[PDB]
Design an enzyme around this catalytic site. Sequence first.
Site, PDB file in Angstrom:
ATOM      1  N   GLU B  64       0.773  -1.226   0.000  1.00 60.65           N
ATOM      2  CA  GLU B  64       0.000   0.000   0.000  1.00 60.65           C
ATOM      3  C   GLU B  64       0.814   1.292   0.000  1.00 60.65           C
ATOM      4  O   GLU B  64       0.575   2.176  -0.829  1.00 60.65           O
ATOM      5  CB  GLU B  64      -0.945   0.005   1.196  1.00 60.65           C
ATOM      6  CG  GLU B  64      -1.945   1.132   1.171  1.00 60.65           C
ATOM      7  CD  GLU B  64      -2.928   1.044   2.309  1.00 60.65           C
ATOM      8  OE1 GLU B  64      -3.503  -0.048   2.507  1.00 60.65           O
ATOM      9  OE2 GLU B  64      -3.136   2.068   2.990  1.00 60.65           O
ATOM     10  N   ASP B  65       1.779   1.403   0.912  1.00 55.48           N
ATOM     11  CA  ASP B  65       2.574   2.632   1.036  1.00 55.48           C
ATOM     12  C   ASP B  65       4.047   2.608   0.653  1.00 55.48           C
ATOM     13  O   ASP B  65       4.712   3.638   0.759  1.00 55.48           O
ATOM     14  CB  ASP B  65       2.500   3.170   2.472  1.00 55.48           C
ATOM     15  CG  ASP B  65       1.086   3.307   2.980  1.00 55.48           C
ATOM     16  OD1 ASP B  65       0.208   3.740   2.206  1.00 55.48           O
ATOM     17  OD2 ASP B  65       0.866   3.004   4.173  1.00 55.48           O
TER      18      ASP B  65
END
EC number: 3.1.7.2
Lengths: 178, 178
Positions: B64-65
């Site tokens: 995700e990040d």
Amino acid sequence: GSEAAQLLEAADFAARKHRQQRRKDPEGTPYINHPIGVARILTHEAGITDIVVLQAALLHDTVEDTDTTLDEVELHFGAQVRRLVEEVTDDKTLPKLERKRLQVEQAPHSSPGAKLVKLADKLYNLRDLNRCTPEGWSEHRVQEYFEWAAQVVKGLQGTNRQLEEALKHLFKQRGLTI
Amino acid sequence: GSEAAQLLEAADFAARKHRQQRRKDPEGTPYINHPIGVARILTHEAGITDIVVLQAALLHDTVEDTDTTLDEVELHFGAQVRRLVEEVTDDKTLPKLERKRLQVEQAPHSSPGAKLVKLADKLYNLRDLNRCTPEGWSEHRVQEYFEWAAQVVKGLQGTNRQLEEALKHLFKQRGLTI
Ligand SMILES: [Mn+2]
Ligand SMILES: [Mn+2]
């Protein structure tokens, strides 16, 4: 109770105590990455599965550089873990040179568990130095670290073939033997 | 290899991927503390021992990040872990409001493992908000988060009594029911 829970307890404890600490690399990497890597060296390269030893690796710098007491460590992880942590805790009240002398002197008298943690700690640091020079460190300082590290490892020998061979190899690359 | 080695592999992997990431708290705590705390919630409060679930928790924000691909996750932890990671990866290309809507809609359709990670993630974040308001966050924004979190959790119910009771209690304190 659980082996998984035991490891996470130590990792979490260490992450919280080291939350404000950072490594000396240009990026100022979160310090917690170091204890985690040291523990990982023990499981993956040394083949260590002793939970007590792995927890000590994750917490090896807590009493040393953070607001943590020996009692606090024993409270959360038991006397066995606390004892290992004691063996791997440098006396920060001593001048740097004196601390280096102490590590060399204390190396042979350490318990098998503490020797494992000391070996993995040194291996992680030498590899990190080879990977990136710390901020404000001269090449001579790096070489100096390796020379001192060699003095310490020589006293930790006969503990783990995998770690010692790796260390011996890195030392040889810089003209240092065992 | 071993349960110990497996947990440390995920912990290390996540620590390296999140090395430059920090939480939104005033002190800007290393982001890695969050995934470690989420996994710890699972072992200590939810009584989870499934190594696959715990690894997914530690890696829940990697794809995700950070610069992490699904294949890389599968390469190091297998398809089971990669799948759980997929279920807990928000689409950052979507506007925030849409992401919030997505989590609400997706909640009930998640696998048991994914629901566990999502439940622990929320519990950690709610506690963190109760403990410290994120920088640049108004109290209404804090309350807004809780209202949204309630909508998501309502769809994750019937998975773990311990986490759900804890979440229910925290929601009630702010006038939110289940
Ligand atoms: Mn160290
Ligand atoms: Mn999260």
